[PDB]
Structures are given as C-alpha cells and as structure tokens.
C-alpha cells in the first residue's frame, strides 16, 4: 500500500486490518509504531510500496521526510534520506517528494528512499530548474479575493462585512488584532472555508500553534 491512505484513517480499521493480516498484539503502542510494523511486514512479504511527504535537511544532510497529516511528528515512520540523492537532485527543505521507498535493513531503524517519481507535484528534472523564493520581485495584490459565496448563507455575514471593511488580495500581508474571547477562531475558519469554496484552485494551508 501507500503511506497516504494509511496516515489519514482512524486507528480502528487500521488495527483491525493489521490483526487480520496478523502482526503482533498491535493494540498498546503508538499509531506510528503500528504503521511502522505494518510497513515492515509488507516489505518482508515482498510487495513494493510508494511513499510521499515533505522533506527536511539537518545541519549535516541527515535528511528526514515527514507527513503533513501527522503534524510533522518525528515518528519512526518518517523516511530517511541520505545526502547523496539530495545533492544529485539538488533538493532542499520544503520540497514535496514522492516515489519508491527502500525498506530498512540491519544497522538502521528508518525507511529509506529507493527512487523518487516526482518532486513537488512536478518531474524531478523539471523542478530542479527553479529559482529561490527571495529572487522574485514583490508586487502589490493585483487580484481580488471575494469572501461572498453567493449562496446567501445565513452565517456568511461575518465574511460579507469583511469585504466591506478589508478587501483581500493575493500576495498581501494580513494581520489581525484581537483580544481574547473575540470570536477570532470562528472568523478565521469561516475565511478559510470561504476561500476553499470560492477559490478551489489556490492551495490553502491553516497553521495552528499551542
């Protein structure tokens, strides 16, 4: 199988299928440990497995690959990446990777990478010929993002007045000043879902800390 479907599933069906295939007493451990054991058993069986995620490099090239669904936890399921392919493909932190993953052997406890079929939703050779982010020229928000869905939702009002107060454009720097108990979280999730509804093309990411 692939890590994509394994990660985004409740542990119920995961543990049931692990027991049906049969690994161990696979109830009292972490979800990452369960996934690691299932992947180890599948690799021992002999079937090839794909892998995908987001890559990060340490200060010595000891590359790791995490998953967005698991909130970038440093679990055993993270894919090990040696500096050799990092230098060969000229990749850096933040490059989405997907391809064949090498099962771990003796001497290491992390899944390795056999080959990469694509990088950041692009061919590995095509994505190499790209400039860094800081080499671009900033420009004002030419395009306009409208929070009006057009369906006349009864709860859409909080978004509507926003368009009457603060227009939203692509590539702008937004700040919100809010005291505690101001309903800012619901406003932010309303904005996020309105963006996902009106503009499905643009990639939406919502970051939460502490």
């Amino acid at each position: 199988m692939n890590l994509t479907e394994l990660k985004n599933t409740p542990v119920s069906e995961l543990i049931t299928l692990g027991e049906n295939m049969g690994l161990e007493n696979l109830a009292r451990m972490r979800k990452q440990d369960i996934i690691f054991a299932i992947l180890k058993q599948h690799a021992k069986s002999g079937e090839d497995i794909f892998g995908d995620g987001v890559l990060e490099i340490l200060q010595d090239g000891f590359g790791f690959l995490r998953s967005a669904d698991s909130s970038y936890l440093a679990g055993p399921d993270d894919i090990y990446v040696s500096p050799s392919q990092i230098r060969r493909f000229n990749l850096r932190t933040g490059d989405t990777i997907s391809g064949k993953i090498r099962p771990p052997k003796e001497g290491e406890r992390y899944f390795a990478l056999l080959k990469v079929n694509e990088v950041n939703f692009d061919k590995p050779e095509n994505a190499r010929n790209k400039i860094l982010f800081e080499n671009l020229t900033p420009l004002h928000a030419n395009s306009r993002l409208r929070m009006e869905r057009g369906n006349g939702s009864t709860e859409d009002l909080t978004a509507r007045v926003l368009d009457l107060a603060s227009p939203i454009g692509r590539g702008q720097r937004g700040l919100i000043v809010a005291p505690p108990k101001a309903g800012k979280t619901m406003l932010l999730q309303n904005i996020a879902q309105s963006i996902a509804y009106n503009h499905p093309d643009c990639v939406l990411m919502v970051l939460l800390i502490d």
Binding site: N142, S143, R144, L145, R146, E148, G150, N198, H199
Partner: protein, 187 residues
Amino acid sequence: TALQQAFDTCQNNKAAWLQRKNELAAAEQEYLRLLSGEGRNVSRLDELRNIIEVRKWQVNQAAGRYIRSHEAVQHISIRDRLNDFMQQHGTALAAALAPELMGYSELTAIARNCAIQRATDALREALLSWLAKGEKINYSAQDSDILTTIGFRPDVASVDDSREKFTPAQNMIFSRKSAQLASRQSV
C-alpha cells in the same frame, strides 16, 4: 507641411480607437457569456470587471485624444486655407476695412484692440448676412480629400463615450492599472 503629419496622426488615432473599441467589445461579450455560463469563479468575475473598467477608461482617453487631433487638423487646414486666401485677395479685404486700419503701427494697445474688435464685428456681420441667404458651398478645392476623409464632424460614437470626465487621481490610478495590465500581459 504639418498638414500631412496631422492627417496621419488622425489616421493612427482612429486606428487605435477602433482597436480599443473592438477589444472592449470582446471583453464585454466574454464577460457576459461567462456570467451566463455555469462557471462560478468569483475571482474571474472581479478581474473581468477590472478589465472592463480599464478598457473603458482607455477607450475614453483614445476618444479624447482623437477629438484633440481632429480639432488640431481642422484648425491647421483652416489656417492654411485662410493664409493662402488672404495672400490671394487680401488687399481688397484691407480696403473694405480701411476706416479702422490706417496707421495701425503707432496706435496704442487699447486703440489696436478696439480696432481689431470693430473689424471682427464687421466681418461677423458680413458672415451672418452671407449665412442668412443660405448659399450652399463645398470644401476647399486644394484640400478637399483630407476634409472628406476626416469628416465634417467626428461621429457620435467618439463623443458619446467621451462625455464622462475623470478626476486627475482617477486618471493616475487608471494609468497605473493600465501599466500593470501591460506588464502582466507582456509575460
């Protein structure tokens, strides 16, 4: 020889105005068909509205500069025709206004201005007397073709869109938006 320059300036102004008109028509028709279409991209609709307004501003400016070019070429043609006409039959004209033209060199500013005003009143009364009978005429023989090809007056389509006046801040922001549009469409 500035008449030919004015003529070609009017010609290219008309060409640019036609280009702006047809591109505005294309933009408005595609905006209307997208409105009638099943697509619901609100960002596309907003950017199309921006395109429509900037194209309307460009059409208005093109009409304004075309009107300026047309009045300039008409003034140049009138000046040249009157200059050769006075070089042809100016002595009789001066004789007809002799009682207020003798010794113009030594006349003071007020006297010269009053004499000029009286001469203008005399020629104005002559012109109105001539126009009372309504004697139909045609264009000047030497430059009839230019007058015919530029028209007696610009068409309504060039003034109906030019009846709206923009504040200077509006002109500046529209110029910036047009520059941004050109920069974004060049790539």
